[PDB]
Amino acid sequence: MFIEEFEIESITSTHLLEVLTREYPEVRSPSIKGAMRWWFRALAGSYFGDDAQKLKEIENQVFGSTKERSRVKISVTPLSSPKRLNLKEFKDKNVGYIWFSINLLGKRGTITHYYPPGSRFRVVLESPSERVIKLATLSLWALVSLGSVGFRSRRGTGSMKIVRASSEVLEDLGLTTEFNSIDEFKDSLKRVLDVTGEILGVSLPSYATLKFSDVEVFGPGKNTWEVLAQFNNSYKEYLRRRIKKYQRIIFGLPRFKLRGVRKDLRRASPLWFGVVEIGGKPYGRIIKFFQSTFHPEVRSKHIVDWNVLSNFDWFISSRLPVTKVWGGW
Numbered sequence: 345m346f347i348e349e350f351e352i353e354s355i356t357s358t359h360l361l362e363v364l365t366r367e368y369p370e371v372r373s374p375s376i377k378g379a380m381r382w383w384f385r386a387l388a389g390s391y392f393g394d395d396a397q398k399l400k401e402i403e404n405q406v407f408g409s410t411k412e413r414s415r416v417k418i419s420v421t422p423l424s425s426p427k428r429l430n431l432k433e434f435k436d437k438n439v440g441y442i443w444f445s446i447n448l449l450g451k452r453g454t455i456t457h458y459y460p461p462g463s464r465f466r467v468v469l470e471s472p473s474e475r476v477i478k479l480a481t482l483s484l485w486a487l488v489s490l491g492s493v494g495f496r497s498r499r500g501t502g503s504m505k506i507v508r509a510s511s512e513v514l515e516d517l518g519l520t521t522e523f524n525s526i527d528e529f530k531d532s533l534k535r536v537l538d539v540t541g542e543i544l545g546v547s548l549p550s551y552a553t554l555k556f557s558d559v560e561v562f563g564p565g566k567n568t569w570e571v572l573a574q575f576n577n578s579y580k581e582y583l584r585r586r587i588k589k590y591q592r593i594i595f596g597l598p599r600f601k602l603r604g605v606r607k608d609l610r611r612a613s614p615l616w617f618g619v620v621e622i623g624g625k626p627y628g629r630i631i632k633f634f635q636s637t638f639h640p641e642v643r644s645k646h647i648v649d650w651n652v653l654s655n656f657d658w659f660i661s662s663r664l665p666v667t668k669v670w671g672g673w
C-alpha cells in the first residue's frame with residue numbers, strides 16, 4: 345500500500361487553462377498528471393529501441409488507457425486561490441514577448457485569474473505496486489526538475505519546485521527534492537537515467553528522450569523576474585531575425601536550396617526554457633531535445649506562436665555565461 349506525497353510551489357506565474365483548449369487549440373495547457381505521463385515516456389524511452397509499441401505497453405500499464413485501469417492514482421489539489429491577473433505587469437516586468445499570448449488573452453478578457461508565484465499544490469501518488477510507485481515518482485521528479493505545467497510553459501510559465509515532501513522512493517534512490525549546487529543537479533540526472541533502466545529491466549529514437557537532450561543553466565539572477573526578463577530580451581532578438589528570415593525564404597526571391605554537407609543539418613530541435621532554483625537562487629534553465637522524427641519551423645499560424653528551437657541558445661549564451669548540466673547529444 346505505497347504512498348508518496350509532495351507539495352509543489354510555483355516559481356513563475358502558472359496558467360492552468362485546460363478549459364480553453366476545446367475552442368482554441370493553440371492553448372495547450374498540460375496538467376500535472378498530463379506532464380508526468382509525458383516525462384515518463386521521456387525517461388523510459390531512453391531505453392526502448394524506436395520500439396514505440398513496447399513503450400506504449402509500459403506507459404498504459406502504469407498510467408492507464410481507454411481499455412486499461414491505471415496502477416497509480418494521482419491526486420492533485422490546489423492549496424492556493426487564483427489571483428486576479430495584472431495586465432500592467434507585462435510591460436513593467438519585461439516579459440512582453442515571450443508571454444505575449446497570455447497578455448492577448450488578458451486584454452480580451454478570456455482569462456482573469458492565474459496562479460502567481462507562491463501558489464501551492466498537493467500531489468499524492470498511490471499504488472499497490474512498488475515498480476509503479478518508483479516510476480511515477482521519477483516522472484514527477486523529472487517534471488519539476490526539467491519541466492513545467494500550464495499554458496506557455498515551454499517559455500517560462502509554470503516552473504515548479506518542491507517545498508515539502510514525504511517520499512520513501514527518493515530516499516531509497518538517493519535523490520533530493522532540491523539542488524544545493526549544480527553538481528548535485530548533474531549527479532541526480534545521471535542517477536535518474538541509471539535507476540530508470542533497472543526498474544524496467546535490461547542509436548537515436550524518434551521521440552524526445554532525456555538520454556538524448558542537452559540541459560543548460562545560467563545565473564544566478566537577482567530574482568526570478570530578472571531571469572525571465574533575460575529570456576525576453578533574447579527571444580525578442582530571435583523573433584526579429586526570424587521574421588526577417590522567413591519573409592526572405594517564403595516570400596522573397598526564389599532560390600534553389602543546396603543540400604547540406606551534413607545529413608539533417610537544418611533540422612533544429614525543440615527548446616524549452618524555465619526557472620530552476622539552485623542553492624536558493626534563481627537560474628535560467630534550458631533543455632534541447634534532439635531526435636530523428638522531424639518538426640518544421642514553419643507552421644500555419646502567427647510567427648509569434650512558432651515553437652522556439654535549439655538555434656536560440658546563441659541568443660542567451662553569447663550574452664551571458666552558460667553551464668552544461670547534461671551533455672547527451
Ligand SMILES: Nc1nc2c(ncn2[C@@H]2O[C@H](CO)[C@@H](OP(=O)(O)O)[C@H]2O)c(=O)[nH]1
Binds near residue numbers: 382
Ligand atoms: N511536460 C511538458 N510537456 C509539454 C509542454 N508543452 C507541450 N508538451 C508536450 O510535448 C509536446 C510538445 O508539443 C506535446 O505533444 P506530444 O505529447 O505529442 O509530445 C505535449 O504533450 C510543457 O509545457 N510541459
